[PDB]
Design a binder for this molecule. Structure first.
Ligand SMILES: N#CCC1C=CC(=Nc2nc(Nc3cc(C4CC4)[nH]n3)c3ccccc3n2)C=C1
Length: 275
């Protein structure tokens, strides 16, 4: 029990996520830039020791495709979670300057797929693949911010949810393949399919409707990639690994450093006047 208000300095706010706020921060002793997620567990003090149990296990993970956990510190009923800082922004931030071209998308999806194809020893992993959770380093490395293991009273956002997840079927890692498909549409178009519909309506249509498709004169191979992820039968969606060999990814992927151009493109958008 050392006080994190003294160990760390908050700089800018970077996230208005769910349980609280994420900050760009700095460790006062070592000067390492970090990400700090603060969550109030006032009435849920019993939850604390479990949350720190999980943070400690996560910090032993060896994936270079997830934002690493460094530890956590209790202050009052607030828990300060200390994580790796990535300075390039999320894909969703970068999308504000416009959708990405196919070579950028294939490059980004390949890095996501490498992280989905990673063997995790941790017990029951949950994932939330979407553009808000895809982070870029300043050098263009791609890491996901959704990674973890097993009183929240709201249903949630449906747009990236797989059919079998909604029909309440016991769901495996094929659900993340579906969500990756939706995220690919999000990167090409700017938003997930049916983003103009009421969420409760979307939640009912997902299991009943034919899968969404990419609208636009994109290459046939990109549309086939999307079609493969968005199979309605979990069993016939391909694995992360089969997808890493899809001709869309193989033909169009570039070195990850090329994604710095998206960072730069966001800078002139800002320089042009938030627009
Ligand atoms: N918790 C949680 C998920 C999450 C997902 C996205 C997110 N957005 C975001 N995150 C970051 N940076 C970040 C976030 C994290 C860590 C996930 C908390 N590590 N680095 C930046 C950095 C610079 C500009 C904009 C940024 N936006 C912040 C947090």
């Amino acid at each position: 029990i050392a006080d994190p208000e003294e160990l760390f300095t908050k700089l800018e706010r970077i996230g208005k996520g769910s349980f609280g706020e994420v900050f760009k921060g700095i460790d006062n002793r070592t000067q390492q830039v970090v990400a700090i997620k603060i969550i109030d567990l006032e009435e849920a003090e019993d939850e604390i020791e479990d949350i720190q149990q999980e943070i400690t296990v996560l910090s032993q993970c060896d994936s270079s495709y997830v934002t690493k956990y460094y530890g956590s510190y209790l202050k009052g009923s607030k828990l300060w979670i200390i994580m790796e800082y990535l300075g390039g922004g999320s894909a969703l931030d970068l999308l504000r300057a416009g959708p990405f071209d196919e070579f950028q998308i294939a490059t980004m999806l390949k890095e996501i797929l490498k992280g989905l194809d990673y063997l995790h020893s941790e017990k029951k992993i949950h994932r939330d693949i979407k553009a808000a959770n895809v982070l870029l380093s300043e050098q263009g490395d791609v890491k996901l911010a959704d990674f973890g293991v097993a009183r929240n009273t709201f249903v949630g956002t449906p747009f990236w949810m797989a059919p079998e997840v909604i029909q309440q079927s016991a769901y495996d890692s094929k659900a993340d393949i579906w969500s990756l498909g939706i995220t690919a549409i999000e990167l090409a178009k700017g938003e997930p399919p049916n983003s103009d519909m009421h969420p409760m309506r979307v939640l009912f249509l997902i299991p009943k409707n034919n899968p969404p498709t990419l609208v636009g004169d994109f290459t046939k191979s990109f549309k086939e990639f999307i079609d493969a992820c968005l199979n309605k039968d979990p069993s016939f969606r391909p694995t992360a690994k089969e997808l890493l060999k899809h001709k869309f990814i193989v033909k169009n992927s570039k070195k990850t450093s090329y994604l710095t151009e998206l960072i730069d493109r966001f800078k002139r958008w800002k320089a042009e006047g938030h627009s």
